[PDB]
Amino acid sequence: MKGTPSFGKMNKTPTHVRCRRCGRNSFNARKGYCAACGFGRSKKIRRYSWQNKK
Amino acid sequence: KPEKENFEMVINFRRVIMGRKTTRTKRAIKYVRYMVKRHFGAEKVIIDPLLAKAITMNGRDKIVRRVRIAVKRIG
C-alpha cells in the first residue's frame, strides 16, 4: 500500500552517502556521482545559471 | 471505651456477589474492612495474608459464600 506500510522499507542502506569534496550527503552511491557538486564525472564544480532566481 | 474483644463472627458475601463479576475479589476484601469497622469501631484494619487467600483461592471472580473470622482487635 502506497503510504504507511511502504515507508517501512526505507530502512536499508541509503541512496546517497557523504561526499569528500563538498561535505554534503549527496554522493549517489550506485552511480559514482555527487548530485550536488558533480564529483565523480566533473572536475569543475557543478553550477548552473538557473540555480537562483533573477 | 470500646472493649478490646476477642469476638469471632461470620461474614456473608451476599451483596458482593450479584454485583460485577470481575471485581468480586477486590470488593470482598473491602467488605471485610467495612464489617470490622462497623462491628468493632476499628479505624484501621489489618487482614492476615492467610485470610485473604481463603476468601478467594478461586482466582478473581469466584469467591466463597461466607467466611468466619476472628478479630484480635488490639488497641
Partner: protein
C-alpha cells in the same frame, strides 16, 4: 460469639514461612481453630506491634499436632 479462653497454641514452619495455630472455645463452648501467619505490623498512630510467641509450642514432627487440628490444617496448608 466472643472468645473466652485459648486452650493450646502452636508454632509450625511451612516452606520457610511461620504459622501460629490457636485452639479456643466460644461462649457456647464450641471449639474453633484460628490460623494466623503474621507476627509484626504497623499501628494506627504510630508504632510497631509484635506478636508474643513465648507461649507457643514449637512443632517439628508432623504427628505432633492433635488429630482434630491435623485433619483440618490440610486445606489451609495448600494456600500458604
Amino acid at each position: 460469639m466472643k472468645i473466652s479462653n485459648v486452650e493450646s497454641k502452636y508454632s509450625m514452619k511451612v516452606r520457610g514461612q511461620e504459622l501460629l495455630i490457636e485452639e479456643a472455645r466460644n461462649e457456647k463452648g464450641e471449639k474453633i481453630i484460628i490460623f494466623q501467619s503474621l507476627t509484626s505490623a504497623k499501628l494506627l498512630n504510630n508504632e510497631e506491634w509484635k506478636e508474643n510467641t513465648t507461649d507457643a509450642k514449637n512443632v517439628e514432627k508432623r504427628e505432633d499436632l492433635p488429630q482434630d487440628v491435623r485433619k483440618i490444617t490440610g486445606k489451609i496448608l495448600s494456600l500458604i
